């Protein structure tokens, strides 16, 4: 298995819902045809300083090629610069 | 009674932060069948076409006015759309599965496997 | 009571100024919950959407006529989410840190620091 990280251009900063899509892979399309997985992460906290969900970070499938797709909820410790399993709630 | 435009922009937003671990929409807890209708169709308009929250608000009202027209008029909601059962019942232990693989390939002859 | 649209604009702009010397927003000298909501969210509205003057007043008028007909429906508003205390308690000096370092490289002699 090979990650590869990449960035995300600036104009998802200006959408209403700033929770990535394949769309903002901008300027990357081969990078969305021949990615095999693609996973973003989002932090609400980042741009909601009222967020409920703090020291919560999502993991949002956007392409998976043998499965579903959707959103993994993990606790994000920045104090100790780590993510680890949510134990709360799971809907 | 049907809810505000305020209380409808929260529910939507609410629906909008925790639908990422519901299986489906159908599965959120919805007080009534018409706020899952509104709620749902205020969402996917918002994914389609980045409404802001001003234009958000807007469409609540319309779709609060639409569906208290409709209501006037008679009409009634059918239970959600539906998609499919859950399913389920697969007691099956390794040994067994094991078994069936060993029979399979018995019976079909693979030379690689 | 709730400030005006004049006073909440106000209010809006002086917490955008004073705002460099708190670590969080939760740490901002609020009178109320609801006026900490509605500025915040004023604020994050305003940087990201990149409003004018008269579009915040808009929004600050829009933000009192739902923080008032929340009131008078009722509800309650909680004590937001806080995050991570401030720790503490280190009552560590050199010559322990350099018993460490000392016993450290004993333990593994393969440092190769000059």
């Given at each position: ?15 209403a ?34 967020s ?38 799971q809907? | ?49 980045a ?44 040994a ?13 002859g693979?030379?690689?496997?």
């Amino acid at each position: 298995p090979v990650v590869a990280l990449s960035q995300l251009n600036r104009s998802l900063e200006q959408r209403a819902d700033k929770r990535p899509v394949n769309s903002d892979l901008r300027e990357s399309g081969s990078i969305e045809q021949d990615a095999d997985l693609i996973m973003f992460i989002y932090r609400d906290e980042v741009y909601h300083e009222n967020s409920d969900l703090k020291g919560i970070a999502e993991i949002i499938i956007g392409k998976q090629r043998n499965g579903p797709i959707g959103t993994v909820r993990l606790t994000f410790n920045g104090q100790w610069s780590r993510f680890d399993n949510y134990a709360g709630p799971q809907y | 009674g049907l809810p505000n435009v305020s209380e409808l922009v929260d529910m939507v937003y609410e629906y909008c932060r925790k639908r990422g671990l519901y299986p489906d929409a159908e599965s959120y807890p919805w007080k009534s069948n018409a706020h899952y209708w509104l709620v749902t169709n205020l969402y996917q308009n918002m994914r389609a076409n980045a409404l802001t929250d001003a234009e958000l608000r807007r469409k609540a009202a319309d779709e609060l006015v639409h569906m208290t027209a409709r209501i006037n008029r008679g009409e009634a909601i059918p239970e959600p759309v539906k998609q499919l059962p859950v399913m389920g019942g697969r007691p099956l232990n390794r040994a067994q599965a094991l078994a069936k693989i060993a029979e399979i390939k018995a019976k079909f002859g693979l030379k690689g496997a």
